[PDB]
Amino acid sequence: GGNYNYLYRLFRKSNLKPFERDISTEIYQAGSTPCNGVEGFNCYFPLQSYGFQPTNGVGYQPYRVVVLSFELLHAPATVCGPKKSTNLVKNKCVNFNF
Amino acid sequence: IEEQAKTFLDKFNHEAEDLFYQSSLASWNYNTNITEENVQNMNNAGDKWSAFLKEQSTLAQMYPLQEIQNLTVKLQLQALQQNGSSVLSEDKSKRLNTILNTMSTIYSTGKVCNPDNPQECLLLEPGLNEIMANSLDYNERLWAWESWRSEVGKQLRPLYEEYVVLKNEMARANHYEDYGDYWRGDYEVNGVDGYDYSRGQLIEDVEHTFEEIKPLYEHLHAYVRAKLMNAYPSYISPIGCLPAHLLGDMWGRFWTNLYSLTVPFGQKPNIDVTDAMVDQAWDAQRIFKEAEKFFVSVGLPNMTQGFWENSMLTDPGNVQKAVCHPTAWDLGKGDFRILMCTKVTMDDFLTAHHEMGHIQYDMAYAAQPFLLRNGANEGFHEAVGEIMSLSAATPKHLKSIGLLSPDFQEDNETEINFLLKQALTIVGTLPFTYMLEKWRWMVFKGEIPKDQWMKKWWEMKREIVGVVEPVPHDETYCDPASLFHVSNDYSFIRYYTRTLYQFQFQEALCQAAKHEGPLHKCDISNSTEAGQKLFNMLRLGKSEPWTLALENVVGAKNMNVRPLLNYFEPLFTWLKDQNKNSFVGWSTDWSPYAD
Numbered sequence: 001g002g003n004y005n006y007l008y009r010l011f012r013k014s015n016l017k018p019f020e021r022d023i024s025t026e027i028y029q030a031g032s033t034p035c036n037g038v039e040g041f042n043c044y045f046p047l048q049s050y051g052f053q054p055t056n057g058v059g060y061q062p063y064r065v066v067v068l069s070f071e072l073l074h075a076p077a078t079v080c081g082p083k084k085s086t087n088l089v090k091n092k093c094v095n096f097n098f
Numbered sequence: 099i100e101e102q103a104k105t106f107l108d109k110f111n112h113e114a115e116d117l118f119y120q121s122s123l124a125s126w127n128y129n130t131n132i133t134e135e136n137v138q139n140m141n142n143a144g145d146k147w148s149a150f151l152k153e154q155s156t157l158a159q160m161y162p163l164q165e166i167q168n169l170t171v172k173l174q175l176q177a178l179q180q181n182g183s184s185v186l187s188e189d190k191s192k193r194l195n196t197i198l199n200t201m202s203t204i205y206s207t208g209k210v211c212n213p214d215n216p217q218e219c220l221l222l223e224p225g226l227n228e229i230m231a232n233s234l235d236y237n238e239r240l241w242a243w244e245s246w247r248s249e250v251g252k253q254l255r256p257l258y259e260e261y262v263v264l265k266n267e268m269a270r271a272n273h274y275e276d277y278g279d280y281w282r283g284d285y286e287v288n289g290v291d292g293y294d295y296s297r298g299q300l301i302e303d304v305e306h307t308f309e310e311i312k313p314l315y316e317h318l319h320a321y322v323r324a325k326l327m328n329a330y331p332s333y334i335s336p337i338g339c340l341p342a343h344l345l346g347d348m349w350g351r352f353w354t355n356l357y358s359l360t361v362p363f364g365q366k367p368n369i370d371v372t373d374a375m376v377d378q379a380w381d382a383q384r385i386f387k388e389a390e391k392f393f394v395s396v397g398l399p400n401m402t403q404g405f406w407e408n409s410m411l412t413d414p415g416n417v418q419k420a421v422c423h424p425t426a427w428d429l430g431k432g433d434f435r436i437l438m439c440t441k442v443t444m445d446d447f448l449t450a451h452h453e454m455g456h457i458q459y460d461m462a463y464a465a466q467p468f469l470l471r472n473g474a475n476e477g478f479h480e481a482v483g484e485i486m487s488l489s490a491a492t493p494k495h496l497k498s499i500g501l502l503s504p505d506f507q508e509d510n511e512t513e514i515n516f517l518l519k520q521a522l523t524i525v526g527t528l529p530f531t532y533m534l535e536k537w538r539w540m541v542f543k544g545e546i547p548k549d550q551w552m553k554k555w556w557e558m559k560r561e562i563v564g565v566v567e568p569v570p571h572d573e574t575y576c577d578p579a580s581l582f583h584v585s586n587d588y589s590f591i592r593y594y595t596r597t598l599y600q601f602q603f604q605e606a607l608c609q610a611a612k613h614e615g616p617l618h619k620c621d622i623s624n625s626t627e628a629g630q631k632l633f634n635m636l637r638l639g640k641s642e643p644w645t646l647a648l649e650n651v652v653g654a655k656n657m658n659v660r661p662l663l664n665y666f667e668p669l670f671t672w673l674k675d676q677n678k679n680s681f682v683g684w685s686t687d688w689s690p691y692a693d
């Protein structure tokens with residue numbers, strides 16, 4: 001029947017700055033005529049909804065996305081990979097790192 | 099301003115794709131599982147699509163059309179701004195729909211009763227089509243031909259006269275001169291630097307291409323006439339026209355039921371691989387999987403993998419009421435389904451290749467906007483489907499796909515049997531199609547007044563087609579309206595141009611696949627360069643003029659009849675030797691009653 005809860009914005013005045021976010025819901029104004037908060041020609045609601053349905057060809061089915069962004073300000077340190085410790089020997093001239 | 103029209107169409111392109119989807123998804127559930135709780139499920143969901151489109155149509159006239167520069171956004175705007183009906187008065191608009199419903203139910207429910215038994219009565223499709231396709235009795239074919247026209251066609255005569263007046267009013271309010279000029283608006287092309295095409299230019303290109311088929315059609319008409327005199331002696335003149343009730347069906351549209359009387363060498367079996375399919379235990383799925391391997395052989399994509407679950411390749415395991423008719427569906431959102439009820443036969447092995455060709459055409463232009471997702475004209479869509487069927491019916495393809503003894507010998511006697519069966523369907527329908535649209539074009543513009551409709555109809559049968567009526571018909575009959583496409587408001591010139599595009603595509607692809615022999619032995623398997631020649635047209639849609647689409651495959655800007663004649667030159671050479679003692683041509687003075 002269509003999952004109409006997943007929307008996207010399809011009209012904006014100007015492209016976003018990187019990592020900028022815009023949740024407003026003002027009536028878009030395409031033409032020169034002012035809109036006064038009501039719909040009509042050249043006065044469009046700015047949000048559309050994917051109507052997802054299970055019988056959609058691939059490329060039409062929902063994909064979930066996660067974007068990891070590593071940043072490095074100027075602190076002293078922070079999270080990182082998980083080092084690995086081998087086995088410690090004994091009674092042998094060895095090259096060690098503790 | 100033009101940038102407001104672009105923002106108009108993108109709201110249209112995302113409300114339409116969803117509303118067209120569920121209006122076509124509900125039409126799938128009715129077609130594959132019939133209840134009445136599905137017919138009411140598709141009539142309200144069908145009307146939400148139609149009510150939405152007239153709301154956006156009346157919004158489209160706020161933008162002018164000549165203040166636009168981009169050709170693509172102009173093409174989308176003109177296809178949506180089209181008024182069509184609704185230009186009439188609101189009491190004339192309901193009179194036109196009453197006529198179209200009355201003419202459609204006369205054709206489907208009209209009955210003919212026997213004069214020896216008035217309690218037995220036949221409909222057209224069960225019983226009257228079987229007499230015209232199977233009988234060899236002269237008196238029974240003459241009864242079924244005349245009684246369909248005198249009992250059903252006489253009811254359509256006062257309805258078709260009122261239909262011409264109301265359709266010419268609707269066409270002249272949309273700035274055409276008549277309704278025939280409205281039908282020729284599909285082939286019109288406006289201002290794309292050298293690729294233009296006028297709506298009156300279609301009339302000369304049909305008549306210029308037709309006078310090069312008349313040498314080939316005259317030798318086919320003379321050979322069939324000489325073979326019909328053995329089947330009906332004392333009924334056919336050796337220098338005259340053919341009687342209209344001895345042609346294989348009700349209207350003489352196809353001559354394909356005359357093959358058992360006109361076969362050149364009846365002691366050679368025409369090749370039929372149906373027994374080799376049931377000897378290797380081929381299921382329902384093998385016929386499509388070998389069809390998918392044909393298309394991936396030429397360099398075309400696989401099926402979409404939603405194609406295999408959602409489709410219904412047979413009638414179900416339930417005794418399930420579901421219109422069983424081969425077709426290809428394009429519901430939207432990249433969801434392609436094929437609906438057919440396939441049996442293990444070489445017939446449905448071939449129409450599997452035909453119906454997959456509609457899918458591969460549909461998968462290619464799916465990146466265009468919504469209003470340009472059709473064929474480039476009305477004739478391209480069926481023509482791409484039938485060059486897939488010609489390449490799969492060759493014995494060269496059948497012996498490499500595993501279905502023919504590697505020790506098979508094709509002789510020159512079986513190629514004549516195959517080519518003559520093709521010419522009874524291809525060449526035999528071309529003067530019928532040309533004559534019928536020429537008659538309907540002259541009726542709409544008024545060159546034929548209504549006191550000469552049936553006089554000019556039968557003069558054009560004797561002169562163009564070479565077919566004479568067995569009983570004289572005055573102006574109380576309407577013999578064109580007894581055909582389906584005339585009484586159900588359909589255009590008929592799409593069957594003429596599709597036949598010419600089909601051999602232009604096939605000859606252009608076989609020069610790219612490096613063929614060496616005759617054109618009728620060709621196969622485009624294992625190539626990649628031919629598929630790249632085909633794919634460059636398939637992805638255009640309606641975004642380009644159709645004359646620009648033809649040069650991407652053929653190399654010309656117009657339809658041409660010389661590739662059609664090159665297909666039939668082995669038959670045309672053999673036909674001119676069988677008509678050394680015959681008379682080629684016909685007389686328009688002889689009649690089967692005029693002695």
Ligand SMILES: *[C@@H]1O[C@H](CO)[C@@H](O[C@@H]2O[C@H](CO)[C@@H](O)[C@H](O)[C@H]2NC(C)=O)[C@H](O)[C@H]1NC(C)=O
Binds near residue numbers: 131132133
């Ligand atoms: C034809 O399809 C309809 C709906 O798709 C089927 O009707 C009902 O479908 C619902 C599912 O929403 C089931 O819960 C009901 O049991 C179905 N009705 C009945 C009477 O079974 C319908 O069953 C389908 N036709 C056939 C012959 O199965």
Ligand SMILES: *[C@@H]1O[C@H](CO)[C@@H](O[C@@H]2O[C@H](CO)[C@@H](O)[C@H](O)[C@H]2NC(C)=O)[C@H](O)[C@H]1NC(C)=O
Binds near residue numbers: 104168170171
């Ligand atoms: C108007 O025409 C221009 C070219 O005549 C189209 O521009 C192309 O647009 C697509 C995506 O919109 C780009 O990927 C191409 O690179 C553009 N081509 C050029 C040469 O810049 C434009 O799409 C047309 N307008 C619409 C609404 O389709």
Ligand SMILES: *[C@@H]1O[C@H](CO)[C@@H](O[C@@H]2O[C@H](CO)[C@@H](O)[C@H](O)[C@H]2NC(C)=O)[C@H](O)[C@H]1NC(C)=O
Binds near residue numbers: 179180181184185272
């Ligand atoms: C479509 O039909 C209308 C008549 O219903 C034609 O006249 C238009 O009338 C409307 C008002 O109902 C005006 O807004 C339009 O300006 C009129 N036509 C235009 C745009 O000049 C109209 O001409 C028809 N449109 C077509 C496709 O020719």
Ligand SMILES: *[C@@H]1O[C@H](CO)[C@@H](O[C@@H]2O[C@H](CO)[C@@H](O)[C@H](O)[C@H]2NC(C)=O)[C@H](O)[C@H]1NC(C)=O
Binds near residue numbers: 510511514672
């Ligand atoms: C099929 O090919 C054979 C072999 O050439 C043809 O037989 C020849 O026919 C001509 C004309 O009748 C004769 O002059 C030759 O002598 C025949 N050849 C032999 C070896 O006898 C045959 O006519 C061809 N059939 C068709 C339908 O084209």
Ligand SMILES: *[C@@H]1O[C@H](CO)[C@@H](O[C@@H]2O[C@H](CO)[C@@H](O)[C@H](O)[C@H]2NC(C)=O)[C@H](O)[C@H]1NC(C)=O
Binds near residue numbers: 624
């Ligand atoms: C055309 O394509 C078919 C399908 O790939 C080729 O058929 C193969 O032929 C070889 C030897 O003739 C066999 O060993 C393979 O088993 C066949 N494959 C299949 C899937 O049946 C065929 O050879 C190709 N034609 C040419 C000239 O390369």
Ligand SMILES: *[C@@H]1O[C@H](CO)[C@@H](O)[C@H](O)[C@H]1NC(C)=O
Binds near residue numbers: 394399
């Ligand atoms: C098409 O599908 C077959 C298996 O079904 C696969 O082997 C082949 O690689 C596919 N074609 C392409 C171009 O990936």
